[PDB]
């Protein structure tokens, strides 16, 4: 029922990404707020179909990696994202991107001890998306039932965002 980008254009959703943004129903995302930081995505066409995300983030003194293949699920736009570790499975929605700016993402749980997981990601090209930018976000969390204590505008972190 999550609405994907009409049109969506995965050749031109490509390349480096900032997670400048999130919103969940996780009940110590809740607290790890806000030990969360921003984080730099780097999204390739997999080989075997599909997106690989190899995200970078800073973690208690390293950066670490990790990287998430994304299977089209149906329709432009439409992904799935399949826990190697946790036999989770996750719907991953670009619901709104203008590809040089932003995307909305938004994953779900489908099956599995995540089933009943919901995230909504601000990704942005730059690191200091503007208001507007972010009020958009804003209004896609709020649609979706996040409540204003759930969104957390990730703060940069200097480290782990090189190449």
């Known amino acids: 029922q999550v609405s994907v980008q009409p049109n969506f254009q995965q050749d031109k959703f490509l390349g480096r990404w900032f997670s400048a943004g999130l919103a969940s129903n996780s009940s110590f ?7 969360l930081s921003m984080a730099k995505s780097v999204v390739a066409p997999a080989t075997d179909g599909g997106l690989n995300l190899t995200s970078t983030f800073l973690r208690k003194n390293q950066c670490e990696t990790r990287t998430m293949l994304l299977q089209p699920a149906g329709s432009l736009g439409s992904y799935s994202y399949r826990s190697p570790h946790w036999g989770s499975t996750y719907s991953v929605s670009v619901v709104e991107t203008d590809y040089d700016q932003y995307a909305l ?10 089933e009943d997981f919901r995230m909504a990601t601000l990704y942005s ?13 804003t209004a896609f969390c709020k649609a979706q039932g996040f409540t204003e204590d759930t969104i957390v505008f990730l703060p940069q972190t200097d480290k782990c965002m090189t190449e």
């Open 105 to 114: 993402l938004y994953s779900q749980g489908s099956k599995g001890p995540g």
């Open 125 to 137: 090209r730059t690191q200091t998306p503007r208001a507007e930018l972010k009020e958009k976000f």
């Open 29 to 35: 995302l809740r607290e790890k707020k806000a030990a």
